[PDB]
Design a protein around this ligand. Structure first.
Ligand SMILES: [Cl-]
Ligand SMILES: [Mg+2]
Ligand SMILES: [Mg+2]
Lengths: 261, 260
């Protein structure tokens, strides 16, 4: 393949969300999408940005013969808190490093006590999941079954469990510099302000000092581009040309129109 | 093929999974699968493991092969879940046994205890809710491999796990729970008798289905010493227990056992 400075469509990168953008919901990428990405990659820079860790993208996008980092110019697991450029790791930080062990424990202890005191129809397990760039917090717990999650969602619609807990956290930890995002049925995310998918754009911008390539056309594709979705900020950011997709078929259609492919 | 047609009559082999059939939380080898399939032409085979089905599916199956196709009996969660020739068997669960209200008393106490607990490190996944138990970790299961090693050494010195088990026994003295401290970072909490011997009810019930009465029940496990989670099923007079150091040792003993 070609170096980034040799791609013919100058100053241009396409960044993709993984789940329901490059891959069907809860499946691996198709060969047709891989073929289209490789064609796109002869024209401009490509990358992905996803919430989950590298291992997850390796399952969804890579194989036993192919490391996912070989398939994209830029890989941004964990919203870009982890990053790869042409297979090489970029320097990174983590949530626990940024907040520190002691403050992290204050946060966790508060959350555990809050959940012990919270009255709910059902409690299960996996109330806090620790990830590299955030925690995920669930009052019922992620071990809730499919049907328990449906029931919690409806209960939460009525009782505002997540909203009241977010507000309680903001009041307990007012100088912690955290953002709270309620998503899906049973949980909300907690991370340092700015550690949404826009975080990855720093790596794209830093390319200027490596190859000299200045990415002024930054296409972003995502399926949760509405307020409150995980793609909302990166979609809305004036640095990107945002493209909202319903799924991978829609992604392919838009890409083919966008680049005459 | 039908259980009543296996030539070695009245005989079943039951295997622990982690460090018996596979390396702990890693994939079965092709040689082991081949040996299991050969064994399966002679007698009934099954596995019994503490973890849920999804774990056994990742260690023993593939995208093309459902783990339930590979064994006559599958007993995830010590047999609180059960499959016979790919079909789910009727079961109970921990939440059914204890009920929501007492479960919340238990979980609230655990959560409050952890909120008060001082440790070098906390992560996530302090309580894991399963069908046959809860698993309780003061550092949390999201602890990395290295953090788990470090916690284990810390716990050896500071008795974090032991003191919390004692605290639970003090708070819930009539709950009919058993506590087992195992591995690096956690302990299990489950109704007394919901150890691996629980699965033997399914083996015994086969008499009313196919008519096969399992009088030779081989069991293979790597934690057959007092306190290990294979101890009860190993020691039970219904089984011929076989203690293994790992999957290589399992293969060696099986080959001797059955001329394979
Ligand atoms: Cl938890
Ligand atoms: Mg998505
Ligand atoms: Mg074992």
């Amino acid at each position: 393949g070609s170096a980034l400075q040799d791609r013919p469509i100058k100053n241009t990168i396409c960044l993709f969300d993984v789940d329901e953008t490059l891959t069907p919901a809860r499946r691996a990428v198709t060969p047709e999408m891989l073929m289209l990405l490789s064609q796109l990659r002869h024209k401009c820079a490509i990358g992905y940005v996803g919430g989950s860790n590298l291992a997850k993208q390796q399952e969804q996008l890579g194989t036993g013969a192919t490391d996912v980092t070989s398939l994209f110019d830029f890989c941004f697991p964990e919203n870009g808190l982890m990053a790869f450029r042409l297979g090489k790791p970029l320097a990174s930080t983590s949530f626990i490093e940024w907040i520190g062990e002691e403050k992290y424990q204050k946060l966790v202890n508060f959350i555990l006590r809050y959940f012990a005191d919270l009255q709910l129809p059902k409690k299960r397990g996996t109330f806090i999941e620790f990830r590299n760039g955030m925690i995920n917090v669930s009052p019922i717990g992620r071990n809730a079954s499919v049907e328990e999650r449906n029931e919690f969602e409806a209960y939460d619609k009525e009782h505002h469990i997540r909203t009241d807990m977010v507000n309680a956290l903001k009041k307990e930890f007012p100088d912690y510099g955290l953002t709270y995002s309620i998503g899906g049925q049973i949980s909300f995310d907690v991370f340092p302000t700015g550690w949404d998918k826009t975080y990855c754009l720093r790596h794209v911008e830093a390319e200027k000092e490596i190859s000299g390539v200045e990415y002024t056309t930054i296409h972003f594709f995502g399926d949760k581009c509405f307020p409150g979705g995980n793609d909302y900020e990166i979609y809305s950011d004036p640095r990107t040309i945002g493209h909202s997709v319903h799924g991978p078929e829609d992604t392919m259609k838009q890409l083919k129109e966008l680049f005459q492919l």
